[PDB]
């Protein structure tokens, strides 16, 4: 209904409530937001993407995100897609990226977890799943998400990049593959390290806008932008954050149950009989989220200062929730 329209006024804002748009769009947050983002950024016009075609692709793609998986469903793709769209508008990165690179980043966030089964890369590897076998144990899930996302474009009624040149399609394919592969947690510590080297030698301009040399520097900041967007839950308002926690602990605990049935060794954060939902977030923020966002904030200061404050407040609420 028109309640949806009210919520899409916050499209360019960090405050968007993606759960709300899910509720007013026949449970299709990803389609919705992607359409809203491409209209807002004039991407359909710039790349001559038929409107009809874009909807069908997005619906098909959203259909491959398993609705019966607690966290890694279409809601999350929509959320990362929207956050990426906001982080892309940050003052420090103004006019830094071409419209092909902007298209690549959002498109990447939208397919970045498509067909997620609800278990980790590690689980699939230790159970010899067809997927681990297929991908030789290296970034199993992410390689797959990319495989599905691009398999869906091998059709006339679904190929949105039909009016991109040979070079434009390849130049985007290359960037998208890189962004989604960077969302693999095992690559997190090395990613944060290369982001720290970027900040060390950061060169802005007179207007406080970063000067990026070539592809190597632009794709590096995009990889980290999508990665931050993936780890953005604890920077959102407390109401939205606690709900995400509930959803990721649901998915994790079901993987813990699945592991217990098969007789494997049950991980600590996946065990519903000893894990503290509250200590899980404190630690998640101290060693993973804050170090990353503290570095990103340094890269674009003071644009991400409001987020950094929200993250400490969110962290402290979770800390006081523990006795
Ligand atoms: C919303 C709170 O987030 C988490 O606790 C959390 C943890 C811990 N691991 N993950 C996670 C799960 C799958 C892929 C990437 C990440 Cl960061 C998430 C989302
Ligand atoms: Mg992922
Ligand atoms: Zn994700």
Total residues belonging to the chain: 323
Q: From residue 146, how far is each of 64, 84, 95 by CA, in Å?
A: 12, 18, 27
SS3 171: helix
- Resolution value, angstrom units: 2.4
Nearest to 74 by CA among 58, 89, 50: 58
Task: Please report the DSSP string for 270-300 in residue order.
Answer: T-TTT--HHHHHHHHIIIIIHHHHHHHHHHH
Method: X-ray
User: Is the distance from the beta carbon of residue 245 to the nearest atom of ligand 1 less than 6 Å?
Assistant: yes
Has 113 been labeled as part of a binding site? Answer: yes
Task: Please report the DSSP string for 308-323 in residue order.
Answer: HHHHHHHHHHHHHT--
Q: Which ligand is nearest the CA of 120, by number?
A: 1
Asked if 38 contacts 54 with a C-beta cutoff of 8 angstroms, the reply is: yes
Q: Which atom of ligand 1 is nearest to the CA of 120?
A: 13
Nearest to 82 by CA among 8, 192, 179: 8
So which residues are the catalytic ones?
72
Which residue of 250, 284, 317 sits with most ligand 1 atoms within 8 Å of its CB, as the best mutation to test the pocket?
Answer: 284
Residue 248 Cα to ligand 1 midpoint, Å, equals 6
Residue 167 Cα to ligand 1 midpoint, Å, equals 36
Look up residue 118 and give its DSSP letter.
S
| 249: its two tokens | 């602990």
For residues 114 and 65, give the distance between their C-alpha atoms in angstroms, rounded to a whole number.
5
Q: Tokens 């692709």, residue?
A: 57
SS3 of the chain: helix, strand, coil, percent, to 5: 65, 0, 35
Residue 316 Cα to ligand 1 midpoint, Å, equals 18
For the chain, what is the domain count? 1
Residue-number span of the structural domain to which 122 is assigned: 1-323
Straight-line distance from the first to the last Cα atom of the chain, in angstroms, rounded to the nearest whole number: 43
Has 76 been labeled as part of a binding site? Answer: yes
Write the burial class of residue 137 (CB in 10 Å: 0-12 exposed, 13-18 middle, 19+ buried): middle
CATH number at residue 236: 1.10.1300.10
Task: Please report the DSSP string for 61-105 in residue order.
Answer: HHHTS-TTSSSSSHHHHHHHHHHHHHHTT-GGGTT-S-HHHHHHH
CA 243 to chain centre: 17
For residues 297 and 308, give the distance between their C-alpha atoms in angstroms, rounded to a whole number.
7
For residues 253 and 263, give the distance between their C-alpha atoms in angstroms, rounded to a whole number.
15
Asked if 168 contacts 49 with a C-beta cutoff of 8 angstroms, the reply is: no
Nearest to 116 by CA among 79, 142, 151, 134: 142
For residues 252 and 277, give the distance between their C-alpha atoms in angstroms, rounded to a whole number.
11
């Amino acid at each position: 209904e028109d309640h949806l329209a009210k919520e899409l006024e916050d499209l360019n804002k960090w405050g968007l409530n993606i759960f709300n748009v899910a509720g007013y769009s026949h449970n299709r947050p990803l389609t919705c937001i992607m359409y809203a983002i491409f209209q807002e950024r004039d991407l359909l016009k710039t790349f001559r993407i038929s409107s009809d075609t874009f909807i069908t692709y997005m619906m098909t793609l959203e259909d491959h995100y398993h609705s019966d998986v607690a966290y890694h469903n279409s809601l999350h793709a929509a959320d990362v897609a929207q956050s990426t769209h906001v982080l892309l508008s940050t003052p420090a990165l103004d006019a830094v990226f071409t419209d092909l690179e902007i298209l690549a980043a959002i498109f990447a966030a939208a397919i970045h977890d498509v067909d997620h089964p609800g278990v980790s890369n590690q689980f699939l590897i230790n159970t010899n799943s067809e997927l681990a076998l297929m991908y030789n144990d290296e970034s199993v899930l992410e390689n797959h998400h990319l495989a599905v996302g691009f398999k869906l474009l091998q059709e006339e009624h679904c190929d949105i990049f039909m009016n991109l040149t040979k070079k434009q399609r390849q130049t985007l394919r290359k960037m998208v593959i890189d962004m989604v592969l960077a969302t693999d947690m095992s690559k997190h510590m090395s990613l944060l390290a290369d982001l720290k080297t970027m900040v060390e030698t950061k060169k802005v301009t007179s207007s406080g806008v970063l000067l990026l040399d070539n592809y190597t520097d632009r794709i590096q900041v995009l990889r980290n932008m999508v990665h931050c967007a993936d780890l953005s839950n604890p920077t959102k308002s407390l109401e939205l954050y606690r709900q995400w926690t509930d959803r990721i602990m649901e998915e994790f605990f079901q993987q813990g149950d699945k592991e217990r049935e098969r007789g494997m060794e049950i991980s600590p954060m996946c065990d519903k009989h000893t894990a503290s939902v509250e200590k899980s977030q404190v630690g998640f923020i101290d060693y993973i989220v804050h170090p990353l966002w503290e570095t990103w904030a340094d890269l674009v200061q003071p644009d991400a200062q409001d987020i950094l404050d929200t993250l400490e407040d969110n962290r402290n609420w979770y800390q006081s929730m523990i006795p």
